Structure formats: structure tokens, C-alpha cells
Amino acid sequence: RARFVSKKGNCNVAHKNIREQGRFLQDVFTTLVDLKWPHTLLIFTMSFLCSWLLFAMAWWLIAFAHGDLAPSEGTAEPCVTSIHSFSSAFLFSIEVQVTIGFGGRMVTEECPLAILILIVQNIVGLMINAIMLGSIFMKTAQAHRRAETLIFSKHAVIALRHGRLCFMLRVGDLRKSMIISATIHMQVVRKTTSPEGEVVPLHQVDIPMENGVGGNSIFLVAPLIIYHVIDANSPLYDLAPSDLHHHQDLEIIVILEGVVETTGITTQARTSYLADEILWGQRFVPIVAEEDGRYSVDYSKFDNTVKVPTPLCTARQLDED
């Protein structure tokens, strides 16, 4: 009735009553990267513009204190040439911080405080440039968007494979570039009650993906059927074909995590299957076919299935009779 993970991978958690809000300010960079894109553009533009405005007010105060803003000229040279307005000081601060340097307004050697302001503005401008440009590149380069081209099967099935019952699903990579060291973790999530009376409201029990070697590591080029053999040690060992209705406390989440080959940042796609999205007694259709010396996958047939005859009984009363 309320799913843990959405079909696109969004987690439906609320995080209520976080009391220790002070530790959120101990990692400002994670919160800065973790923002939305309008807030990221706003903080980018605001950081640069307020740095320019602060140093513009500094240059304007220097030109005031030297008496350069007053047009009563004698022969003494200003600290900065041709500054006679706050707009002039703002243009000069932009020219210094962006390192444009038009030269209509340049620092002269008259004011020793102006050289200190120039040094401080250059240092803070280099620091702001580094921390902001690196942050915006890290934001536009993070690999959680690569999960958009990692498709899963819309429905999972439970079918007879090699005399056992297996929970099978299909995961496909949509582009040419591989995902390096891809691993699959499937978790049965439901409310469990311990025999001693302990009730775990959202218990996540790992179901081992049948691989052949035991380790969970796939090579994803063609869309391959990831399946878990319902053994005696599996929490689906008492799952019934009539138990796959809606409003059933059972949800199998799948977490595929790897390294994107192009960027190099570790990505993680995830999906979820409720009890009504699990089709008992069906199996996937083969979509890989050889044509003209290459292999071809028909991604339109990705989630198509066929009703094959399986017994309508649990894996336990299949293992015994």
C-alpha cells in the first residue's frame, strides 16, 4: 500500500525529527552539491556577485578615504585610476576578480592599502573560483543520472528453472559504454516478527543472486535475466502463488551498483517489485538474436512474458512433494 522504493529508484522515506541539526553544518560541501539545480545556480551566481559587491564596496571606501571621489583635483595620483562612482568601483572589482583587466581603471602605487585590497581580492577570487567551479563540475558530473539508462523489467516472474523455483527479472543497459564491476544486491523487505517477540517494521533480508560462483558480479552488455533460486535458506521459501496480491507485506528491491566507464564515478540504480508486480507462472521471452554477424536485442520485447506451466504451490511443498 506504501512502497519502500519507487519504480524509478526514489526512496519513500521521511526522516522525521532530526534533532542534531548542528552536524549538518559540519559538511557544508555535501549539502552544497546535494542541492537542486535552481538552488545551485542561485548560490553560484550569488557567491560570485556578492564577492564582487563586497570588494567593490572596499574599493569605493578606499577611493573615498583617499579623496579620489571628490572631483577637486590637484596633482596627486589616485589609488585606482578613473574611479569616480560606485559603478566605477563595481566595474573595477569585476575586472580584478574575473581577471579581465581592461585598464581604464588600474591600481597605482600611491595607496599601499589598495595593494593589500588587491592581494586579498585575488586570493579570495582564486579560492572562490576553485571551490565553485569544481563544485559545479562535480554536480553536473555525478553518476546518479546514469541510472536513467539502466532499465529493469517492469514485472518480475517466478518460474521453474532446473527443477527449482526461481525469482527472475531482467536488467538492461541502454547505451554502448559499459558499467565496470557491476554488482547486484536483491533484498526482500517486509515486516518481520522474531520468535522472541521482536517486531522489525522494515526488515531487509539479502537474497543471494544465483551466479554460479556465489559472488554477486555481473557483466552487463546484453539484457540478462538476474534470478535467485528459492532454496530452503531463502525467505521466499514459503511464498505462495495466491500470496502475490496487492496489500501484501512483501517487496523485493534490487540494487545494481557499478562504475561508469566514461566518467569513473560509482553509480547505483535501484528498483522495486511489490507483491502484485511479481507474476507467478510466467517467464521472459528471448530477445537476443543473431543477425548479419552481430547480436541484436529487441528492447521493445523487454518486459514481455509468457505463461508457462508451473505448480501452484509453495517452494516448501514443492521440495517435499
Which residues contact K ion by CB under 5 A? 101, 103
Cα–Cα dist 95/80, whole Å: 12
Contact (CB, 8 A) for 73 and 125 = no
Cα–Cα dist 297/53, whole Å: 57
Out of a second copy, K ion, none, what residue 90 binds, judged by CB under 5 to 8 A for its kind, is a second copy
Cα–Cα dist 231/57, whole Å: 73
Q: Does 20 bind a second copy (CB under 8 A)?
A: yes
Judged by CB under 8 A, how many residues of this single chain contact a second copy?
Answer: 147
* Other C-beta atoms lying within 10 Å of the C-beta of residue 39: 11
Q: Which of 296, 307, 312, 317 binds a second copy (CB under 8 A)?
A: 296
- The interface with a second copy within residues 102-131 (CB under 8 A) comprises 102-104, 106-109, 112, 115, 118-119, 122-123, 126-127, 129-131
- The interface with a second copy within residues 157-216 (CB under 8 A) comprises 159-163, 174-178, 180-181, 183, 185, 187, 194-202, 204-208, 211-213, 215-216
Cα–Cα dist 225/152, whole Å: 10
- The interface with a second copy within residues 205-234 (CB under 8 A) comprises 205-208, 211-213, 215-217, 219, 221-222, 224-225
Out of K ion, a second copy, none, what residue 276 binds, judged by CB under 5 to 8 A for its kind, is none
DSSP run (H or E) holding 303: none
- The interface with a second copy within residues 234-273 (CB under 8 A) comprises 253, 255, 257, 259-268
| CB nearer K ion, residue 106 or residue 288 | 106
Contact (CB, 8 A) for 306 and 281 = no
Q: Which cell is 149 given?
A: 539508462
CB of 321 to a second copy, least distance (A): 18
| CB nearer a second copy, residue 175 or residue 245 | 175
In 3D, which of 277, 220, 263, 320 has the Cα closest to residue 7?
Answer: 277
Cα–Cα distances (Å) from 201 to 52, 98, 197, 235, in that order, read 53, 55, 12, 16
| CB nearer a second copy, residue 27 or residue 317 | 27
DSSP run (H or E) holding 313: none
Q: Which of 77, 238, 276, 298 binds a second copy (CB under 8 A)?
A: 298
Over the window 62 to 101, marking each residue x when it contacts a second copy by CB under 8 A and - when it does not, the resulting string is: -------------------x---x-xx-xx--xxx-xxxx
In 3D, which of 39, 223, 29, 256 has the Cα closest to residue 144?
Answer: 256
- The interface with a second copy within residues 23-42 (CB under 8 A) comprises 23-24, 26-27, 29-31, 33-34
Alpha-carbon torsion 117, 119, 122, 126, what sign?
negative
Cα–Cα dist 194/196, whole Å: 5
Out of K ion, a second copy, none, what residue 61 binds, judged by CB under 5 to 8 A for its kind, is none
CB of 103 to K ion, least distance (A): 4
CB of 211 to a second copy, least distance (A): 5
Cα–Cα dist 168/205, whole Å: 17
Out of a second copy, K ion, none, what residue 312 binds, judged by CB under 5 to 8 A for its kind, is none
